[PDB]
Design a protein around this motif. Structure first.
Motif, mmCIF file in Angstrom:
data_model
loop_
_atom_site.group_PDB
_atom_site.id
_atom_site.type_symbol
_atom_site.label_atom_id
_atom_site.label_comp_id
_atom_site.label_asym_id
_atom_site.label_seq_id
_atom_site.Cartn_x
_atom_site.Cartn_y
_atom_site.Cartn_z
ATOM 1 N N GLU A 234 0.822 -1.225 0.000
ATOM 2 C CA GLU A 234 0.000 0.000 0.000
ATOM 3 C C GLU A 234 0.849 1.265 0.000
ATOM 4 O OE1 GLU A 234 -3.573 1.665 0.559
ATOM 5 O OE2 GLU A 234 -3.172 0.420 -1.223
ATOM 6 N N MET A 235 1.917 1.256 0.800
ATOM 7 C CA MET A 235 2.856 2.366 0.886
ATOM 8 C C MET A 235 3.454 2.699 -0.483
ATOM 9 S SD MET A 235 6.572 2.737 2.471
ATOM 10 C CE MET A 235 7.207 2.522 0.807
ATOM 11 N N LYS A 236 3.938 1.677 -1.192
ATOM 12 C CA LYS A 236 4.436 1.811 -2.570
ATOM 13 C C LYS A 236 3.445 2.512 -3.504
ATOM 14 C CE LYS A 236 7.268 -2.353 -2.500
ATOM 15 N NZ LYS A 236 6.758 -3.750 -2.441
ATOM 16 N N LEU A 237 2.195 2.040 -3.533
ATOM 17 C CA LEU A 237 1.155 2.638 -4.379
ATOM 18 C C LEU A 237 0.914 4.113 -4.045
ATOM 19 C CD1 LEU A 237 -1.605 -0.200 -4.535
ATOM 20 C CD2 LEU A 237 0.335 0.057 -6.106
ATOM 21 N N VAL A 238 0.710 4.393 -2.754
ATOM 22 C CA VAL A 238 0.499 5.748 -2.230
ATOM 23 C C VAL A 238 1.731 6.650 -2.430
ATOM 24 C CG1 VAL A 238 -0.189 7.125 -0.195
ATOM 25 C CG2 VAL A 238 -1.169 4.854 -0.539
ATOM 26 N N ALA A 239 2.931 6.130 -2.179
ATOM 27 C CA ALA A 239 4.156 6.921 -2.374
ATOM 28 C C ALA A 239 4.324 7.355 -3.830
ATOM 29 C CB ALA A 239 5.382 6.166 -1.894
ATOM 30 N N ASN A 240 4.038 6.435 -4.745
ATOM 31 C CA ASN A 240 4.128 6.684 -6.171
ATOM 32 C C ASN A 240 3.097 7.659 -6.702
ATOM 33 O OD1 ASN A 240 6.300 4.974 -6.175
ATOM 34 N ND2 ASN A 240 5.090 3.208 -6.842
ATOM 35 N N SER A 241 1.861 7.570 -6.215
ATOM 36 C CA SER A 241 0.842 8.561 -6.557
ATOM 37 C C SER A 241 1.219 9.955 -6.053
ATOM 38 C CB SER A 241 -0.521 8.171 -5.999
ATOM 39 O OG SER A 241 -0.838 6.831 -6.306
ATOM 40 N N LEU A 242 1.847 10.010 -4.878
ATOM 41 C CA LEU A 242 2.244 11.265 -4.264
ATOM 42 C C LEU A 242 3.452 11.861 -4.976
ATOM 43 C CD1 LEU A 242 1.727 10.431 -0.454
ATOM 44 C CD2 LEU A 242 0.274 11.942 -1.782
ATOM 45 N N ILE A 243 4.462 11.035 -5.247
ATOM 46 C CA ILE A 243 5.639 11.479 -5.998
ATOM 47 C C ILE A 243 5.203 12.024 -7.366
ATOM 48 C CG2 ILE A 243 7.788 10.765 -7.151
ATOM 49 C CD1 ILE A 243 8.314 8.930 -4.680
ATOM 50 N N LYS A 244 4.419 11.239 -8.113
ATOM 51 C CA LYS A 244 3.967 11.584 -9.467
ATOM 52 C C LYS A 244 3.255 12.937 -9.558
ATOM 53 C CE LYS A 244 1.095 9.805 -13.304
ATOM 54 N NZ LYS A 244 0.076 8.783 -13.673
ATOM 55 N N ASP A 245 2.188 13.142 -8.782
ATOM 56 C CA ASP A 245 1.379 14.362 -8.935
ATOM 57 C C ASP A 245 0.942 15.102 -7.663
ATOM 58 O OD1 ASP A 245 -1.186 12.735 -8.548
ATOM 59 O OD2 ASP A 245 -0.571 11.941 -10.502
ATOM 60 N N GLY A 246 1.707 14.929 -6.585
ATOM 61 C CA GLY A 246 1.502 15.677 -5.340
ATOM 62 C C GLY A 246 0.335 15.262 -4.460
ATOM 63 N N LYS A 247 -0.729 14.750 -5.071
ATOM 64 C CA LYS A 247 -1.942 14.351 -4.356
ATOM 65 C C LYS A 247 -2.402 12.954 -4.785
ATOM 66 C CE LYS A 247 -5.475 15.925 -6.716
ATOM 67 N NZ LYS A 247 -6.771 16.607 -6.988
ATOM 68 N N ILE A 248 -3.344 12.380 -4.042
ATOM 69 C CA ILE A 248 -3.899 11.063 -4.384
ATOM 70 C C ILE A 248 -5.429 11.088 -4.327
ATOM 71 C CG2 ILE A 248 -3.604 10.096 -2.059
ATOM 72 C CD1 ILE A 248 -2.990 7.358 -3.397
ATOM 73 N N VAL A 249 -6.045 10.381 -5.271
ATOM 74 C CA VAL A 249 -7.496 10.312 -5.393
ATOM 75 C C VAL A 249 -7.942 8.910 -4.991
ATOM 76 C CG1 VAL A 249 -9.472 10.942 -6.827
ATOM 77 C CG2 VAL A 249 -7.232 11.830 -7.419
ATOM 78 N N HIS A 250 -8.901 8.852 -4.071
ATOM 79 C CA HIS A 250 -9.476 7.590 -3.613
ATOM 80 C C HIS A 250 -10.903 7.418 -4.109
ATOM 81 C CE1 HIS A 250 -6.103 6.412 -1.209
ATOM 82 N NE2 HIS A 250 -6.129 7.542 -0.523
#
Length: 299
Positions: free
Chosen positions: A192-208
């Motif tokens: 889960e950390m990997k998925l969330v870290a990558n979404s955050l690195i890529k575009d600053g925010k994450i959509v759930h």
């Protein structure tokens, strides 16, 4: 040393990956732990570790303290209050010891773990125990006007505390299997950390994903399901045929024991695709179909 103990070897091996995180104002002062996940200087912590600082960036100066003593400033790449994760950036630092990440799906009950905190932190601790449970929904209180959430945790009988939080949960191969979060301890799993870290690195925010419904758990301590309290106007749920007083028992491929599991189950879905939601309305077993919206308060 070679007369060194099993946990002593593992703790020493990961030490340079683990980091102190401090946010200072002219008034207050916060301290947590973090893990170096990328050679370019990306560090993962909890959202709650950096929460107050991110809410008041003006007056808070966040710094990272390495195991060697070096103190560099740090910037918030992004944060997710829903999963209690946050990523921090550190610029132009030489020879960071990057943590090796593991596979949280290969983790089993009984596995010996170390909940490792920052080596140079003030309250700082390293604790040891076993994995008590997998896929355990835990409600977390979002302090400082953050939204309350539920995470799908690795439960551990290692003690997770102030001196531990945001630091890695480490298995016997010296691999990161979780981020320490919160009468036993809980960690956010590394997959889960990997998925969330990558979404955050890529575009600053994450959509759930969201479904538009609120739930209440039906049984006290047994897995009877999640009862629908309200179906909001125009929601994915309403368009799918979720009525009020339905008892939800499966969302996607994940079973639903209660309110807490419901929340973690919805997060597992993808925003685009159609997904089955099993339900027990007034008696019978009916399988509704829902397409989840983004959770944005923005276009």
């Amino acid at each position: 040393q070679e007369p060194a103990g099993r946990f002593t070897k593992v703790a020493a091996a990961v030490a340079d990956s683990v980091v102190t995180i401090e946010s200072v104002s002219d008034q207050e002062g916060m301290q947590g732990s973090g893990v170096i996940v990328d050679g370019r200087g990306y560090i993962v912590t909890n959202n709650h570790v950096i929460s107050e600082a991110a809410n008041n960036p003006s007056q808070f100066k966040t710094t990272v303290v390495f195991n060697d003593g070096k103190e560099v400033p740090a910037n918030l790449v992004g944060r997710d209050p829903k999963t209690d994760l946050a990523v921090l950036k550190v610029d132009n630092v030489d020879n960071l010891t990057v943590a090796r990440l593991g596979d949280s799906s290969k983790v089993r009950v009984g596995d010996e773990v170390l909940a490792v905190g920052a080596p140079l932190g003030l309250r700082s601790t390293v604790t040891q125990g076993i994995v008590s449970a997998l896929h355990r929904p835990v409600p977390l209180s979002g302090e400082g006007s953050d939204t309350d959430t539920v995470i799908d945790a690795i439960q551990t009988d290692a003690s997770i505390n102030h001196g531990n939080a945001g630091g890695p949960l480490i298995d016997m191969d010296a691999q990161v299997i979780g981020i320490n979060t919160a009468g036993l301890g809980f960690a956010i799993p590394v997959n889960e950390m990997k998925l969330v870290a990558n979404s955050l690195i890529k575009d600053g925010k994450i959509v759930h994903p969201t479904l538009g419904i609120s739930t209440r758990s039906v049984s006290n301590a047994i897995a009877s399901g999640a009862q629908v309290a309200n179906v909001k106007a125009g929601s994915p749920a309403q368009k799918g045929g979720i009525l009020e007083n339905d008892v939800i028992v499966k969302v996607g491929n994940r079973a639903v024991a209660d309110s807490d599991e419901f929340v973690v189950a919805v997060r597992q879905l993808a925003i685009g695709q159609d997904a089955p939601i099993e339900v027990v309305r007034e008696g019978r077993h009916v399988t509704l179909t829902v397409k989840p919206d983004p959770d944005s308060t923005k276009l």
